[PDB]
Structure formats: structure tokens, C-alpha cells
Amino acid sequence: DEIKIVKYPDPILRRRSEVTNFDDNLKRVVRKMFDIMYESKGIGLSAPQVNISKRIIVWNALYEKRKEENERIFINPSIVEQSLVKLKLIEGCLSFGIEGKVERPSIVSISYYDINGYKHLKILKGIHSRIFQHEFDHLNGTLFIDKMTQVDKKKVRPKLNELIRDYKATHS
Amino acid sequence: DEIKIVKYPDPILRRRSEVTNFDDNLKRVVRKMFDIMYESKGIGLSAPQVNISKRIIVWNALYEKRKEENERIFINPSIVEQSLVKLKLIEGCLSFGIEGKVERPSIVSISYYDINGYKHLKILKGIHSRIFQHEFDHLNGTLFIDKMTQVDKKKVRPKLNELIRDYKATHS
Amino acid sequence: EIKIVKYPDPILRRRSEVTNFDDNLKRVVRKMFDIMYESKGIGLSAPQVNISKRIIVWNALYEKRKEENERIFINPSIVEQSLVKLKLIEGCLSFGIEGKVERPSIVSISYYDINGYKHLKILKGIHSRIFQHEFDHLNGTLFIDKMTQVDKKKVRPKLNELIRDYKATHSEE
Amino acid sequence: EIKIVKYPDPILRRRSEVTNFDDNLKRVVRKMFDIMYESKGIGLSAPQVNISKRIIVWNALYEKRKEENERIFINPSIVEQSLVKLKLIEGCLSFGIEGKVERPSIVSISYYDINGYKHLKILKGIHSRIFQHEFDHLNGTLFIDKMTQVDKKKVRPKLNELIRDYKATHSE
Amino acid sequence: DEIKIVKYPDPILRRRSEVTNFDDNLKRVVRKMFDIMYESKGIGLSAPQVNISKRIIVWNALYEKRKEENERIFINPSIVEQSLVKLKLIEGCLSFGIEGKVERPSIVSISYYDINGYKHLKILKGIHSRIFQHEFDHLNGTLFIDKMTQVDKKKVRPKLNELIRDYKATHS
Amino acid sequence: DEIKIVKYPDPILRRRSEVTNFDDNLKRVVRKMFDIMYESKGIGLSAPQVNISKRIIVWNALYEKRKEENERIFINPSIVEQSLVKLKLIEGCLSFGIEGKVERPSIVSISYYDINGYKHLKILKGIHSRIFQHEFDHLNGTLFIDKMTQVDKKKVRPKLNELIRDYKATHSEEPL
Amino acid sequence: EIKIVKYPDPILRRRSEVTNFDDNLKRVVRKMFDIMYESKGIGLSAPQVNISKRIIVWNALYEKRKEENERIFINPSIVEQSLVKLKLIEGCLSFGIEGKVERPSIVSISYYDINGYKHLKILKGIHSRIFQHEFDHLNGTLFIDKMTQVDKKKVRPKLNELIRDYKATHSEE
Amino acid sequence: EIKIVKYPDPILRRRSEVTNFDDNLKRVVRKMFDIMYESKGIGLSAPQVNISKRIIVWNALYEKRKEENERIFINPSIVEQSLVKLKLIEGCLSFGIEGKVERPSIVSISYYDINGYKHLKILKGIHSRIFQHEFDHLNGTLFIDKMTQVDKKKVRPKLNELIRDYKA
Amino acid sequence: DEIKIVKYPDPILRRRSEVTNFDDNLKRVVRKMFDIMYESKGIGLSAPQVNISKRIIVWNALYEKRKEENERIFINPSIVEQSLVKLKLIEGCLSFGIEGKVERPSIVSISYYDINGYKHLKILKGIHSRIFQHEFDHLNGTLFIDKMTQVDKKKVRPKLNELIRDYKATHSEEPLEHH
Amino acid sequence: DEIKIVKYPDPILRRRSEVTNFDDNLKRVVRKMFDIMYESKGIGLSAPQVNISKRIIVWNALYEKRKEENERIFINPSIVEQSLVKLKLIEGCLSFGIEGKVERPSIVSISYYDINGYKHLKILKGIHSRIFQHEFDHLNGTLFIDKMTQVDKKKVRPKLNELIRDYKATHSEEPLEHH
Numbered sequence A, B, E: 001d002e003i004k005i006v007k008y009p010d011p012i013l014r015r016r017s018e019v020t021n022f023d024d025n026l027k028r029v030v031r032k033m034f035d036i037m038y039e040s041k042g043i044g045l046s047a048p049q050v051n052i053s054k055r056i057i058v059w060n061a062l063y064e065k066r067k068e069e070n071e072r073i074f075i076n077p078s079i080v081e082q083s084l085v086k087l088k089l090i091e092g093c094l095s096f097g098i099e100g101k102v103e104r105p106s107i108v109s110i111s112y113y114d115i116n117g118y119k120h121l122k123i124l125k126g127i128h129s130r131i132f133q134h135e136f137d138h139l140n141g142t143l144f145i146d147k148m149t150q151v152d153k154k155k156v157r158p159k160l161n162e163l164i165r166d167y168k169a170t171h172s
Numbered sequence C, G: 001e002i003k004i005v006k007y008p009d010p011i012l013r014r015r016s017e018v019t020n021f022d023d024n025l026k027r028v029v030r031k032m033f034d035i036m037y038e039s040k041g042i043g044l045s046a047p048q049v050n051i052s053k054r055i056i057v058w059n060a061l062y063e064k065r066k067e068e069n070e071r072i073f074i075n076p077s078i079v080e081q082s083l084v085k086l087k088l089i090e091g092c093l094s095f096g097i098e099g100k101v102e103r104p105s106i107v108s109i110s111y112y113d114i115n116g117y118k119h120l121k122i123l124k125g126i127h128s129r130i131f132q133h134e135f136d137h138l139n140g141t142l143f144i145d146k147m148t149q150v151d152k153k154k155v156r157p158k159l160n161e162l163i164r165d166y167k168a169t170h171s172e173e
Numbered sequence D: 001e002i003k004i005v006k007y008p009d010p011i012l013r014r015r016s017e018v019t020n021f022d023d024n025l026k027r028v029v030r031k032m033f034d035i036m037y038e039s040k041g042i043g044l045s046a047p048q049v050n051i052s053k054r055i056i057v058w059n060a061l062y063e064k065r066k067e068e069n070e071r072i073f074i075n076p077s078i079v080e081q082s083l084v085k086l087k088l089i090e091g092c093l094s095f096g097i098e099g100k101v102e103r104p105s106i107v108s109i110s111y112y113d114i115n116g117y118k119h120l121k122i123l124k125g126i127h128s129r130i131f132q133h134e135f136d137h138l139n140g141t142l143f144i145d146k147m148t149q150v151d152k153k154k155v156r157p158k159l160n161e162l163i164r165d166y167k168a169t170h171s172e
Numbered sequence F: 001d002e003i004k005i006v007k008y009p010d011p012i013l014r015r016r017s018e019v020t021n022f023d024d025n026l027k028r029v030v031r032k033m034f035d036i037m038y039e040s041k042g043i044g045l046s047a048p049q050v051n052i053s054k055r056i057i058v059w060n061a062l063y064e065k066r067k068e069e070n071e072r073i074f075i076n077p078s079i080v081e082q083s084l085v086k087l088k089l090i091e092g093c094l095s096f097g098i099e100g101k102v103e104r105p106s107i108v109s110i111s112y113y114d115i116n117g118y119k120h121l122k123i124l125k126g127i128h129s130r131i132f133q134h135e136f137d138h139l140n141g142t143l144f145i146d147k148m149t150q151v152d153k154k155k156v157r158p159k160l161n162e163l164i165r166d167y168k169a170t171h172s173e174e175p176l
Numbered sequence H: 001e002i003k004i005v006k007y008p009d010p011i012l013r014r015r016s017e018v019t020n021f022d023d024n025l026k027r028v029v030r031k032m033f034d035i036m037y038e039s040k041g042i043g044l045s046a047p048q049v050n051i052s053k054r055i056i057v058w059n060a061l062y063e064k065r066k067e068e069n070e071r072i073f074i075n076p077s078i079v080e081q082s083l084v085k086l087k088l089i090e091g092c093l094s095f096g097i098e099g100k101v102e103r104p105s106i107v108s109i110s111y112y113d114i115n116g117y118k119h120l121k122i123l124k125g126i127h128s129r130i131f132q133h134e135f136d137h138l139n140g141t142l143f144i145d146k147m148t149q150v151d152k153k154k155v156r157p158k159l160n161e162l163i164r165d166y167k168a
Numbered sequence I, J: 001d002e003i004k005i006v007k008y009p010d011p012i013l014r015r016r017s018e019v020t021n022f023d024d025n026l027k028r029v030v031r032k033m034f035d036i037m038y039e040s041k042g043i044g045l046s047a048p049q050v051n052i053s054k055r056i057i058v059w060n061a062l063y064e065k066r067k068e069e070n071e072r073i074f075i076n077p078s079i080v081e082q083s084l085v086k087l088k089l090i091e092g093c094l095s096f097g098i099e100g101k102v103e104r105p106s107i108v109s110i111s112y113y114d115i116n117g118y119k120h121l122k123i124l125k126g127i128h129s130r131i132f133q134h135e136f137d138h139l140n141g142t143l144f145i146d147k148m149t150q151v152d153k154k155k156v157r158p159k160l161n162e163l164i165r166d167y168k169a170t171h172s173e174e175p176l177e178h179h
């Protein structure tokens, strides 16, 4: 429930988030994330990004003008199937003031759990499939710079290094 | 590729249909299928039911009033995930003058190919989710009598025996 | 009980049980006429008001309710039936669904009144119709079981809708 | 036949057979009525006129022979009798004797008309009494078999007189 | 004479029924065998199924409408010949709330004795063939589960164990 | 497929008929069998009676008014059961311009093959059971004069002797 | 006795016995006549009413029942017969069957009347026919024994039919 | 053959022979009738006119000769006789004597007509009487042989008269 | 060519009539056959019925008015198929003063040869059919009293017997046969 | 019930048709049978020719003017007798744009059943006896080219092979059988 966005070289971000068990009254965690997300002008957020190794993901395609129920909460998700047609779009990420291009499938077939424990199945496509794929990768210790282009990773190496240095200058 | 509708004890109704390869200019196959279903007045139809051992499923929830592209066509489907809530619904089949309840999941995550061989991802729910599942089973040799309720399979027993005998007079 | 029950309810499929104590609960038969009156219906059995008791009530003139135009049939039994059958259109209070059912036209009958006394009657009529619908409720038989292959087929989606609607009893999901 | 038969005749103890040909033997039914009107009785059955067939007729108002009051019942069956019973006086064209007999008040019946049409009826009262009497005739049961121990006794002489009178046969 | 229909596990159901001697005045045995069957809503019955280990077999192809002389009765029977052509049909049994597909020869040639002791010869074919063979197998200690397919045997395991549980409460 | 009614003494009528194998395209043999029988005004007939040592039996219970499929055909018959009750009836035979009383059981339970060779199972009762057993004996080299009574065999002595000498005129190279 | 016997009875093959008591059982002779009249038969003998006695009765004009046109014969015996014979078509009441038998034209008869007295007589015509039929019956000879190959064969089905019906009578199993 | 032979003539004691040729010799039967007519006799047999042949003829009404009323019997033979007997006065054309004899009343007969044809016949009465008289003639039996002990003794005188006439 | 009708007990009426060969110069056999027919008030006639053991049959449906070529002639006949539908009619014969019911098929498929020799095929139905099978039966030695009903066979026995005695006067110079 | 006329090399044309059983509510079968015969400009038709291996024969000897009750129908036929006199007439058959002479007897004795199953017996003579004989052979799987003449069968070899070729284009995704 932290007011802590985390940054690139923190090793939590590379860990494996754990399955959520008790599905009740910690929707406050889901609130903390959203709050953090809303104030960091971000589109999506995973729990690892606020120091919680839990398989939680949220987002809002319209965060620029917040509204409950335009919000999308996905507990313990999995990608059941995915398309063949892929797409190189641009992505950013609240753990990186960086931005670049990453190729991911266009359409994802999903299974997940709601805020009270109930399973759902859904096809996400559009900007929703883009952010799911992003935020789902956080839950597995994959960052978007792992999926980035050889060119772009090079085109962004200095700011990867700066982020590495600001981290370096911190430990108790 | 027939106007030959099949009936219960045909051993083709038990063989596992094979995957479709030549995905063009044999929409007449699917056209035959629709016709035999239309005149027999029934909601769905898979290829095995017209003596073609191929992975083709078609249907139309609105069959009292025929309409193009109100028709559903599914080549080479597969069930990638299914709901947890299941529902006991009365069901019918063109290869059985019989009807009765079978319990199947309510919603299903689908993956199939269209008539031109393009893959699609889809969440089928409700009545459309019911028929798909009936027809998918035909592609796998599963008949709806195998999943029926103990009360119904008993209530329908004489009719089933009736149909076996009728069929056995196929040979003399 | 002001509980008409809807289709998929498992009580409608149980065997209704013989009335033993044949006196002073008449309000049970009154609860029944009252629901059947209020629900705009012609006949009523106790399983339809969630009571597994072999009781059957009706009124060919229910759009003009009048006592003693009311018929009560406790612990009934069909001793004979006419060989001539009739295909009439039926409905039921456990279903917003409708279809043609074929039942013998006339039925020889035996039963017991509100007081405990046995009787013998030849029900021929719409009385013969209803008795036969309502007796079946007492033995877990419902009119869709006797409906025609075609009306059965036609009425499948709606029947399923009631299953979906009913399944929403444990649907806090 | 203008053959009224009397008590000790053994035909009265046989079992009468079901009518097969329902037509042009309403004459048999006419003489049963004829005999019956001529001997001042209210019921009669075919064995009583020396015909071993399941035919029963009556008229509860035999003191004014009115056709529309006449009742024919061919191949009868008692489908149900009542619980409550009744001791009523009874006589018989086959016996100049009289007395009480206990029989159920109301009967549920099934029989065929003079042309063979099957009907279902509840007889109660005077007609339930006669039927039950007359039905017994078709089974080889006579009313003295069911008589009260008091009356059977009080009716010893007459019965023995009838055995006497009948024995003219072979006592020529 | 017993209203003791037996169930799967009882040991009498596996003994070899003994040949009927004294072919008379135990017609009630047969009647009480029909009685039991009639109330159990069953198509056929053998004597061991009512705890009499005698070689008696009865049935009615239309038990759903009970008429006499629609009743078939077979005493001390044997199968003199049987068809080569065989048939899988779905069978049930009054000793088992269970059901399965059993393959039997289609036509049998029978020799038997009736209710009076006279040997008869008959070719039973069809639905009368099925039932005879079922019930005959009771006279030999064969049960229908002995000839079920593996699949159906497995598929009905729990109920066979359920019936064995229930039985052990005899010696509770 | 011969028009050869054979008569009493012929040695082949005492032979054991062999079992049929080609169960197709030889209907005419059986048709000729029927034909021969018809023009001889006879009730039943088996293949040896037309000089064919094959296990084949036919008859028409109503041959004074012939109809197709009113005729009966049995290929490779066999007797699976038979009644205890016997019955003494008068029989005739096309092989013998003779008649007499032979006891055979009332009912026989049977198995055979059709014109196409599918096995059957039938109960013959009555005249069908009477004729069957007459014609089945032929397939086994059993003629009805064996199963007769001493009376009816005596009473028929001189016609068998006429038949025996008629037969010796197959090779009548002498005035006898 | 009303016991008309039919073909396959064994009694019809037995040797009847000589009448001894020649009095007051003359109604047995009438019984025979009655049996004959209702079965529309021209003749009849004691074996065929199931009486193994030597009695022969007939009325050659039986279409007109008339006493003294009837002929009774007790303990007959044939003493002479014509060299000349006749093949006439006969019936017998023990068979629904018909056929030709070659019997001599005229026979010379010795017999006894109802009361025991002997008579000598010459039978000629149809009376000679019938006598020789009925006399044969009293020696266990049937007319199928004197029939012709051709006629014997014509009536074979009918004979077997009668044999069936008989074996049946005793134990219709 | 004319004159009726009388009693002691030995021919009346020889057995007559069966006729073979049922011929156009009805003249033989006719003479017999003539002779029989002119001696006012009811019966005659061929022996009596010296024809040892088995022919018996009569006419119960010879009083008025009527051809159809005549009875011929060639080669007769008795085949049965009545048990009841009868004593009747007999007379014979070979004797002026007369007396009672006891024969059966009725006879079952067999014989041959004028053409060879065989017949069977029940003779009763006077034809039964006369047949039995003339049949004996065929067998050389004479009616005094069967006569009563009474009448035989009673008439022996007259037989002696006949016996004497036989002389010269 | 005989002018003699025949009667029941003649033994020739039970002899198998022979097949005709020489098909010419004997129209008079047929003529005399017809000649006999009219004068003996009978509808048809077969050759054995005039003492000729040869397979010939002739008739006239309308013979109460003689009309030549309204005649019908059938040499060497053979019945090749018959109706399934049977019929009972009162039949009679010129060899009997006797009449009764006989059951015969309604329609018949025939084959026969003409007076010149040529073969023919014809379906005969009704009364022609009826007359055909009577006269045809004669040619095989079958007489309508073989096919007579049990009732009419019995009802006519005296008569049939009477006809036998009648016939026995063929050799009756003797007295042992009466009339 | 097919609008499928079949051609020469079809093997069904050589099969022996089965005996028709259920004689009701299959008048359409016969009607379809008739329908294709008028549009294929033809005089005769048996059921194997429309791909029904059943013993059915129909014809109309005036089809240039189609008239009901001028149509002839023959269920389950047989030939009980045939004429001795024979005749070479020109024939053709709808499973062939081909024609030739075929010697068949002139007249035939027949038996069959109508549309309801009543056994009839009949004499066919002329155009009727010709069509029947042809059409009947189809039910026994005999084709007119088997009875065609030595001259005419050789004269028609080409067209017979063309149809063998053209039939072979049934299984011809293989183009070498274009004709």
C-alpha cells in the first residue's frame, strides 16, 4: 500500500509476483495502486511497481480524466491464447522516464480473477491488450526493455545508465 | 460432402474428425451443411453429421428465419479455456429424434480459423456457447448422450435402442 | 406459502406424499386457492406452492371467483381413462411457456375430500384436462414431458432461459 | 329365449363369455327385456335366459315399461367400488325368494353399448344395487351366496322346493 | 411370494437357480413375481430377483400398460440355438439403479416349459430376445455387469460400490 | 437342374447328401426343382429326388394353386429340437407312386440357410413340420418306407417290387 | 349315445360283439337313428355311436323322416353275393370325406329283428350298398380300405386333418 | 320228353346233372310245363320226364295257365333255410298218394335263369314248399322219404299198388 | 368325327388327351364337334366329350342363336398363368344331368394353336375363362365333380350313382342291373 | 426420386433391380420417372435409368403429346410366355444418343402390379411389346447393345467409346480425359 513508485534497477521489479489468495478487503491495495497511478499520470500499474510481489494489475485508458468503472482490475491473470499478427507500438512505463518500441501480439485471450474471487474470461484488443501485456510482464520480472528493439535499446542506453546511477547512490 | 444426414449409431459419429487444410473454394461444403440443417429444422450442425469427417462446425440461433452472416461458421476450432459456472440445459441433436439435459460450462474461450484460414480469438457465452460445445464434441466423437443426465439417459433409453435396431437394418 | 415455484426447482420432480391428517389445516388449501387466484391461473397443486403433499385445486371460472365452484382433490388416483385422446393447448404457473399436450379426454377417478371421505367421479371436461395436468404435478410429471416433439423443440430456448434465471439463486457471482 | 331359468340350473353357476359381435343381436336384448317385463322384475342377465354371455339389462321403473328408461350394459367391469356399504332387500327372477345382502353403495363401472362403444360411468343408488346383483350373475355368483346368515336360514324351505321343482328333469 | 426385490451384492444373485419340479398350484409365485415387477416399473423379472432360487422367467414388452396374456412366462428354460449376428443395446435391471450397453446375439432359439408342465419350442426375436437373455442369465448367476464394456464398467464403478455400501448395513 | 424325378430303387436316394457351398447364381437348380415337383403334382421335393446329391429342400403347401414366395426353400437344414409328442399321418412321395402312415413328431425346431446363405432359425409346426421331416430324411438317405408300420409296409409290398423290376430295365439288356 | 365317432378312433377298427339281450333297450336303436337324422346320414351302425355291438340301421329316404321306412338289422351275416360288382360313390358319417368303392350289386342276407327273431333276405340296390357299408363297420373295415389309389390320394389331406383333430381332442397341448 | 315216370322207376333215384348249355332248348322247359299242365300238376322236375337234368319248374296258378306266372329254376342250390319248420300235405306227380311232410317254411335260394344268368332269391310259402319238393327230385330224394312215421305206415298199401303197376 | 355324346362313367373321360399333329383336312372333326354341341344345348364341348382322345376345345358364349365365327376354337391348349382372384359359379356338363358350384380363377393367360397350326397367346376373362378351364380340365381327364364343393358333391351323389348304374347297362343283357 | 438420368457405362445399369415392396405413396418416384422422360424426348423408362435399382417400368407411346392415362405403369413384371414370331425393329435408349436394330419376339404374355399392388395379366402387342421387352431387360441388367446386330454394333463403336470416355470424366480432375 505504498506511495512508492519503484524504479528500473530495483531487484523487486525483476522478481516473480505471487498468486493472491485472500480475495477480500485489501481492495485498498487496489486503491493505493490506482492513487499512485493517477498521481504519476500513468496509464497502467502492477503491484510490483509499488513494492508488492502480488499478481495484481490495474489500468485506465482514460486516466487523464479519472472515473471509477473506467478502471480495469485483474487479479491472478494468465494469457490463455494470443494472436499471430504482432505489432510494434510505443510504450513507456512508470519505472522508467524512458520510451521506445516493443513488438507484441495484437490480440490476447485472457483469464483472470476479479476483486472478489470470481473468474472471468475475456478477449482484449486495442490499447487494452497493449497494456495488459505490459503490466502482465511486470508480474514475471520482464521489463519492456527486454522486449525492445536492438536499435532502440541503444537509442536509450544513456538514460538507462542515469537511472542505474541514481539507484547506485542509494542503500539505507 | 453430402445431403446425407447421419443418425446416431453410425460409427463415423465416433471417429475423430481431421483438421482442414485446403481452406478455399469449398464453401459449398459449408453450403451443403447449412442446407441439410435448414430443411431438417435444427439449430446447429457439424460436418460429421453430414458424413464428412472434417473439423467444421456451423450454426444459426435464428433458424426459423434464415439470414446470411447471421450464420456462424467455425473451421478448426479448439477450446482454450472455459468458465467455472456450468449450466444444465435441454439440448437437441439432428442425429437423434431425442432431446434432454447435459451439463456444460456457461462461457468458453474459443480459437478458430475462418473460411480463408485466418485465426480468430473469441469468447462465446449464452446460447452461442451452448451449441458450439455440442458441435465441438461431434468433431471429437463425443455424442451428447455421453454427457447427459442419469435421469434423462434412462428416460430416453428405449428410443436409443429403437434407433440402434433401425440402423441395424442397414445390412441384410 | 406465497411461493409459487418456477420450472427447474427440484421439488417439482419429487413424488408428492399422501395426506395423512385429513383435517383443520384447510388454510393450506386456502393458501393455494389464494395464490392460484392471485396469479391468474386455472389450476394448482401443492408442489407448485412448495409443499410435497398430494393436493389438487381448481376453478374453470377463476375470472369470477366463487367458493363452491372450487374443486378440491386430496390423495387422488386415476382408476380409468377414455381411449379417445385430445390435443389441447396448456400452460402452467411454474412456466411462462405454452404448448399442446395430448391427454385422454375422459378419466374415471378416485380421491378424498377435505374431510377424509373417499369419492368416485367421472371427470370429463376441462376438468378432465386440468386434473390430468395437476395430478401429474403430484408425480413429478410436467407438461413439457407430454408436449409434442415440435412444441418441445420450439420451446427449448425459453425453457433454458428459466434454467439461467433459476441458476441465479446461487448467483452472488 | 322365453326361457327364464331357475336356481339349481347349473348354467347360472358358469362364467358368461364376453360378447364379440356387437350387432343384430339386440333381439337377444329385446327378449331379455320382454321376459323381464312379463315376470315383474327390475333386472335381468343373459344366463337367466339360458345364454352364457356377459349381458346385463334393467329398468328401475318396470311398472311402466318405458324404453328411454331401459339400460343395457354389455361386457361390464367394476373398476372401483366404494368403501361405505349397504344392506338392502333383493329378489331375483331365478328365485321366488327375498332378502337382504350387503354391497357397496357406489360403483365405478366400464362397459360397452349395444353397438360396441366403450363408456365409463359411476352408478349409485338403485342402479348400483341392480348392477352389482346382475354383474354377479355373469360370474356364477347368485344372491343367496351373499345373503345374511339369518336370511339364508329363513329361506331354507323355498330353496329346497326349487331343487325339488327343478328335479323334474330325469324324473319323468 | 416375497416383495423382496434384491439388489447387486446379494449372494443369491450369483447362485445357479434350481430346476422346477412340481409344475402346479404355485401360480401365485408367478403372480407375486409379476406383482413385484409391476410396482418396480420393470420390463422383466427372474425368480432369484425375488429371493426364490428357482428357474422361472417372466416379462411384458408393454409393462407401462399392464394387460394379462401380454405376460410371457418361461419355466426351466434353455437356449437351443442363437444367431451369429450380434447386437449392442442399452440394458437396465431391477437389481441395479444402473444402466449399460451389453452385446447379445439378436435371435435365440428357445425350449421351455409352461405353467402346466408342457414343453414348448419357440424362436424369440427382437425385444423379446433381449430380455429373455437378460433374465436367463439370472438363472445361471450371470449379471449384466459381467458383460458390460470396460468403459461402461468403469463408468459405473461408484454405483456398484454404493450398492455394496448399502448392503453392508444389513449386517450393521 | 434336371427334369429327372428319380424313383425308389436308385442308389443315390440312399446316399448322404453333401453340404452346399456356392450360395449364389444357382437359383435355377432350385427353380427346376420346383418346376419338376409342380408338373408331377407333388407337395414337397429335395435335390436327390432330381439326381443332385445336395442338401437342398423345397415345398409348397398349396401346389394346386402355385404362387411365388408361397413356396418354401431350405439350404443345409438341421434339426435342433423336436417335440416329444408324435403323430401318425399318411404321407406320399414323388419317388414312390405309393402312400402310407408314418409317425414323426409334431413340432421341429430348425436351422438352415437361405438362397443367399444367411443362417436362419425357425419353428415348423404342422404340415410344414410334416413335409420338412419327409424331405430332410432324403438328404440322409432315409426313405419313408423304413419309418412305416408292418401293415402299411406289407400292403405296399407288390408296388415296390414293380418299382424294383422297373429299375432293372435301366440296364434291360435281356427279356429278364 | 350322441357319441358320433370319427375316423381315427380305434373302436372303428375293432370286432363288434353279438347282441344278446334282445329286449327293452330299443331306445339305443332310436338313439342311433336320432344321431343319424341330425348328421343327415343315410346309414349308421353301432360302432359309430361308440357301441361295440352288431347293429345296422338306415333309412334310404332320410330327407323324409318316417318310421317303417327305417331298416334295423341285428347280428347280420352275408350268405351269398352277386358275381357282378359296382363302383359307387360312398359317404360315411365318421368322415366329412367322399369316394368310390367296388362292392357286389346284390347280397343274400341272414339277420335278426329287434325282438330276437331270425330273418332271411335279399338286398338289392342302394339297400345292398348301405348294408355292405355298415356291415363292414361291424368288422372294423372302413371304406378307405376298399377305396382306390386315385381316390385314396385325393382324400389323404382330409384324412390327416381328421387325425390331427383327433390327437388334439385328448391332449390339446 | 313226354310221359311222367312213376314211383319205382330207378331213374327217380339218380342224381340229376347240372345244365351246361343255357340254349335255345327252352323247348325242354316248355314240354315240362305241357306235361305238367295236362296232369293238372302244380310242379314238375326234369327227372320226372326222364331228363336227368337239374331243372325245376312250377306254376302256383296252373289252374289258369299264364306264361309270366311260370317259375323256372336251372341249377338250383339251397344256401340257407329257416329255423321254423312246417308240416304240410304234399303230393307228387309220380304218385296218386298224398300226405304230410315237415320242411322249413322259408328258403334262401340261388339258381340260374333260362339264359345262364345267376340269381339269388327268398322263396317263402308255396314256392318254398314246391321248390323243396322238386329240388329233392334232382337229388333222387322222394317225398315219401321225408314223410311222417304216421303217414308212411298209413300209405304203404298204395305204394305196393304202384310197385305192382311197374310190372307186366 | 363322332355323333355320340359321352357320359360320366365312360373311362375315356379320364384318359389324357393326346397332342394334335396333322393340322389339316379335319375341320369336320371340329365341325361335327360343333354340330353335336348345338343339338345338345350345351355351351362348349371338348373332343373326349364326343369320344376323341385328342386335345381340342370349342365354344360359343351365345349358342342359343347359332352364329358361325362367333364360335371359338382352341387346339392344343395350355394354361400359362391364372388369376389369384377365384370365383364360384354354377357349372354343368354334357356328360352329366348334374349341376353345381366349382371354384376356379377369374382370369386366365392362355396359349393355344389354330386350326391351321399357328400358335397364339390370349388372356381369357369372365365366362370365356370359365368355359376354357372346364373344357381344358376334360383334356387332362379332370371332371367338374373333382372341383365341386363338399356340399354340392354330397347333394348330387344319388344322381352321380344313378348315372353309374345307367352306364352299367352297356353289358346288361343280364338282369343284375336295374332301372 | 432422381432427376439423374444415367448413361451407358454406369455399373448400376448392369445390376439386377430389387422387387418393389411397399406399394404406396411413392407415385412421385414414378412421376419423377415420367418427368425426365418427356424432357429427354423419350418413349420409355425403367428405374435403374434414373438411378433407382427397383423393378419399375413406365412408358408413353405418344409423348409428343403427353397425356395422363396414356402413360403405362408396370410394377414388378415378368414374362410368362413370348411369341415364336420375332422382329427386327429399330430401337434407341435414353442412356445412349445411339440407335440400332434388335430382334425381339412380336408378342409377350405379361403379369405385373399397378401402383397399388394388384396383380394383372396382359397381352402386349406391337410398340407396347417392344418398349416393354427393352425396358424389362434394364431391370435384369441387360442392355440393348447386347442384343443389337453384328452390323449395327460395329457401326456404333465410336459413340459407345465416346460415352465410355465421357463417363470416365466422372473421376477426371485429370485433364487427359477431355473430349
Ligand SMILES: [Co+2]
Pocket (backbone or CB within 6 Å): A092, A093, A094, A095, A134, A135, A138, A144
Ligand atoms: Co511498466
Ligand SMILES: [Co+2]
Pocket (backbone or CB within 6 Å): B092, B093, B094, B095, B134, B135, B138
Ligand atoms: Co449433435
Ligand SMILES: [Co+2]
Pocket (backbone or CB within 6 Å): C048, C091, C092, C093, C094, C133, C134, C137
Ligand atoms: Co401446473
Ligand SMILES: [Co+2]
Pocket (backbone or CB within 6 Å): D091, D092, D093, D094, D133, D134, D137
Ligand atoms: Co338375479
Ligand SMILES: [Co+2]
Pocket (backbone or CB within 6 Å): E092, E093, E094, E095, E134, E135, E138
Ligand atoms: Co436383471
Ligand SMILES: [Co+2]
Pocket (backbone or CB within 6 Å): F092, F093, F094, F095, F134, F135, F138
Ligand atoms: Co419323398
Ligand SMILES: [Co+2]
Pocket (backbone or CB within 6 Å): G091, G092, G093, G094, G133, G134, G137
Ligand atoms: Co360308414
Ligand SMILES: [Co+2]
Pocket (backbone or CB within 6 Å): H091, H092, H093, H094, H133, H134, H137, H143
Ligand atoms: Co314230386
Ligand SMILES: [Co+2]
Pocket (backbone or CB within 6 Å): I049, I092, I093, I094, I095, I134, I135, I138
Ligand atoms: Co364338360
Ligand SMILES: [Co+2]
Pocket (backbone or CB within 6 Å): J092, J093, J094, J095, J134, J135, J138
Ligand atoms: Co433403354
